[PDB]
Amino acid sequence: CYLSETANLGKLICIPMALRAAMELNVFQLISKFGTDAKVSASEIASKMPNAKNNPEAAMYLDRILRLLGASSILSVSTTAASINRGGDDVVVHEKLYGLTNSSCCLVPRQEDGVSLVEELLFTSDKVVVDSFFKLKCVVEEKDSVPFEVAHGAKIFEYAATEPRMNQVFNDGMAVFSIVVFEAVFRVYDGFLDMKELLDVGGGIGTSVSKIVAKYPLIRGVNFDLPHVISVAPQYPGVEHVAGDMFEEVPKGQNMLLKWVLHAWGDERCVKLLKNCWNSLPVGGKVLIIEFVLPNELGNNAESFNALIPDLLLMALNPGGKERTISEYDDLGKAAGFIKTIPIPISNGLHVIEFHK
Amino acid sequence: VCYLSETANLGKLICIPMALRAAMELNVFQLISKFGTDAKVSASEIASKMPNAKNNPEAAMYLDRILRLLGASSILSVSTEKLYGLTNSSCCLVPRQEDGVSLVEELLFTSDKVVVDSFFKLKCVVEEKDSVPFEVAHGAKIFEYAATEPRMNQVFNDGMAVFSIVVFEAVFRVYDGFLDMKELLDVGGGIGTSVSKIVAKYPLIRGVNFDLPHVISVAPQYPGVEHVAGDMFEEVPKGQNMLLKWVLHAWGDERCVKLLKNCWNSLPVGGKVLIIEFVLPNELGNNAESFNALIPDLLLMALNPGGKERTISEYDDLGKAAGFIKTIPIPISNGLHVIEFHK
């Protein structure tokens, strides 16, 4: 009935915004620091927040966020015999205990290097992205509209050159997610072993090629991106930075990488970029495409959602952006002069697709 | 645990509500329903009924990319261009053929930019004593903002009013307590839709709708309803019986007791005030009664100082502090209650 569906439909905006607040308050890392199978109250978690130390009501407000995440199965919820038993019939215990789940373990920065899914999820729920989603209907109603352009007056990469906060949130979301994806690549794919040089075309701040050279130290690494990205990139061992425009000229390189680049652009733009890569490669060279591939038949699984999530984001964020099937990627490479397409499944829809010159 | 499994579970959370808002603004669910409520239809068939899309060759392919995410999330059925059909959830997004009622107006209010911009400041309520996320985002409190922002005033007022109609249809199936009333004052009654529906069912009730000037001045004329403007914290008009629906949950304990004492002073011996709210259950889980309370609990935490959902015991404590001497809680549906306070 209506008053069943109010719950199913009304929770949809609330859950992601409660999740974002919990990430910004460092809830998941604070729970982790109590140990392996920890179950801790809102007051114990708030005790570890110096910013809350003069707010008597902090824990009761925090509990209101955490109990929604518990109902949604993002946190586990429990109590103790002492809480049920010690106060007597006239005392009410309002505070339950919260623990991590398989999903919230992926929101804890790792002890060794700080990696997790936090930075990418803070980008996809950033106000710059949500404001673009508020204009999503314009793609259906208006020929050649782009929601990001309706919201902001500029396209995304040009906007990043003028807005240093957005530039940082985007660049860090790509870089930390990159580390997670390359750990999965290196478990399955052996095509880097024989290389002597790798050029990362649209390589962001250089994190991806930094990880490739760390694993394969005989590779000379080159990172190529727009001026406003290269100006903020760190110095990485074994990585040379190059600034420019991939649609005008790609540097010469023995092999090339395009990760999370083709999915932002329409077919003509993709073929133009791939022809620029072909001209700058030697005979025998290859370019590697790394993307979440759209399955031939969609269903209820991680591989399907891993493509549908960025398909909706790129529809909002850039003209022509979309996720593609194996056959659609093959068609782009073939149109640009490449041969011997080799699609390599990695994990949950993530592929390496090799294009040979 | 695998990072590249959990990317799917966590990354869809922001995407689903924003796809749902676009589909409601494009009237997708009503367009499917006009082929027949059991119909299965393609993105191109749906787009052919949107005059705004008629010079956009690419409209159906973009529409399909929105609808296939909703089909993967149980809001639409998908079958083999794929064909889309309604579900139990999306039938509640079709304006009724009889009167245009659905959940659309309330769902467009709780995902409105004014509300989402408040949720961007939600962490401030934990860190900073006495902060309110809406105030941090907008520079004024919500009812003051509505007085200077006509678009927001309309979205809020219409969300409350259309939701009110489906709530009172549930109330009238279970609760008989309006019979033999001769007069009812709706305190904080919005644009008056609630008291209009009570007088339609109980034609001997003289209905009075009471709210702030910026709400009353935009309210429609309803048969059997008189509108009065004022400030409920300063004084409430005399009335034989009163209603407080979705009012107490916006305010802290001291403000609630002040308002309830104003109501007590303006009631006769033998009068009652009715509280209508979604009541917080004693145990929370993955079920409609739990989420019906947790959704507005999170919204009012963001939107107004002191606002929160309450248990039956906590409502009783407020009525007793204001002088009321008999509390009768009446379950209606999925956590919604009528709670009578007797003078």
Ligand SMILES: Nc1ncnc2c1ncn2[C@@H]1O[C@H](CSCC[C@H](N)C(=O)O)[C@@H](O)[C@H]1O
């Ligand atoms: N014309 C252009 N020339 C070079 N880089 C460009 C470009 N237009 C966009 N880009 C870059 O394309 C990248 C897309 S995001 C992906 C970054 C990285 N390859 C990763 O997988 O993490 C951004 O860093 C962006 O600045």
Ligand SMILES: Nc1ncnc2c1ncn2[C@@H]1O[C@H](CSCC[C@H](N)C(=O)O)[C@@H](O)[C@H]1O
């Ligand atoms: N000081 C005050 N005096 C009277 N109305 C007030 C008020 N402060 C807030 N309100 C009103 O309280 C209402 C809360 S929203 C609920 C409206 C209606 N009772 C329903 O259930 O649909 C709004 O219409 C708002 O304008």
Ligand SMILES: COc1cc2c(cc1O)[C@@H]1Cc3ccc(OC)c(O)c3CN1CC2
């Ligand atoms: C499965 O969940 C996700 C998967 C992916 C992304 C975000 C998710 O949450 C991001 C989103 C995104 C947005 C804009 C981009 O360029 C403008 C961009 O390259 C990417 C990369 N993709 C990689 C795939």
Ligand SMILES: COc1cc2c(cc1O)[C@@H]1Cc3ccc(OC)c(O)c3CN1CC2
């Ligand atoms: C179960 O889903 C929902 C339940 C409820 C609301 C919205 C939902 O989506 C709205 C949200 C809301 C926000 C602000 C208010 O005053 C400032 C207000 O009275 C209400 C009313 N409540 C009624 C209960």
